[PDB]
């Protein structure tokens, strides 16, 4: 029932993610083709999640296998994620430098997956962010 780490693909198979960003971070995205770091740097497989935030909503296109590469270095934030992904080690301190943070959020939210919840992916500012930025293919500002 919980919406998994990836749900949507291109007509060509690229993996699709979402994030609502600041103006400063959006300037870098146009001019550096990078997602700038900030805390967990969460990406979402569902637009309904990130659309709930103020800022510039962007549809991010990633190379096929991106989610798989992050999962290899993945850790679970809380127990709700630790239950759906029992095969992942628990989140330490310092995951932002080496790991991808998976977190279940927005349960009981009618707009998002009929209240079923969504597993977002934290890229931190280290390897997970590098994996995603290296595989980044395209972005699209939705208004």
């Amino acid at each position: 029932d919980p919406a998994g780490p990836i749900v949507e693909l291109d007509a060509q198979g690229n993996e699709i993610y979402y994030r609502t960003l600041s103006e400063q971070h959006l300037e870098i995205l146009r001019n550096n083709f990078e997602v700038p770091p900030t805390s967990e740097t969460f990406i979402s497989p569902l637009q309904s999640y990130s659309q709930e935030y103020d800022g510039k909503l962007v549809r991010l296109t990633a190379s096929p296998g991106t989610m798989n590469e992050l999962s290899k270095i993945g850790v679970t934030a809380n127990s709700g994620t630790g239950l759906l992904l029992p095969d992942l080690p628990p989140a330490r301190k310092g995951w932002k430098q080496n790991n991808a943070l998976f977190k279940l959020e927005a349960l009981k939210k009618p707009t998002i997956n009929e209240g079923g919840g969504v597993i977002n992916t934290g890229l931190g500012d280290g390897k997970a962010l590098e994996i995603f930025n290296k595989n980044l293919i395209d972005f699209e500002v939705i208004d």
């Binding site: 960003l21 600041s22 870098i28 146009r30 001019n31 550096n32 740097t41 969460f42 935030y53």
Partner: protein
């Protein structure tokens, strides 16, 4: 009006942002990413020459800071964006850019604001084939 942000200082204090912009522009193998370099490499001498003579699209806005709030996800600081009521009483939203040496805390509602803009073409066109621009803040001035 005092300069709270200047792109010239951004160029020298954030050279990593500049290098990657030029490398992304000159990278012939990634034709959908980054700035085109139509009016010169970002921040180059040609760029300011084209900014000066007005061949790169520019706009200038003056008004009052109406809201100091927070946009985006996973942000640590207190505010990163401002809404501006111009004299045509149009709404403008912009990030609260500051330099390393300028203080972010001077952004307060009711303080007066001036923002000078440049618009640099991106490689990727709009769906209908039109030229799409990266909005580049050149200078932000504020009253006290």
């Amino acid at each position: 009006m005092k300069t709270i942000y200047n792109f010239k200082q951004r160029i020298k204090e954030d050279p990593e942002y500049i290098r990657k912009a030029h490398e992304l522009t000159l990278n012939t193998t990634k034709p959908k990413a980054g700035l085109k370099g139509t009016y010169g490499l970002l921040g180059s001498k040609e760029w300011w020459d084209n900014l000066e003579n007005g061949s790169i699209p520019q706009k200038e806005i003056s008004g009052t800071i109406k809201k100091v709030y927070l946009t985006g996800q996973d942000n640590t600081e207190d505010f990163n964006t401002i809404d501006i009521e111009t004299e045509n009483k149009t709404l403008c939203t912009e990030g609260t850019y500051t330099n390393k040496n300028t203080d972010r805390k001077h952004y307060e509602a009711g303080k007066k604001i001036t923002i000078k803009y440049a618009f640099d073409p991106l490689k990727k066109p709009k769906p209908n084939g039109d030229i799409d621009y990266s909005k580049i803040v050149v200078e932000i001035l504020i009253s006290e």
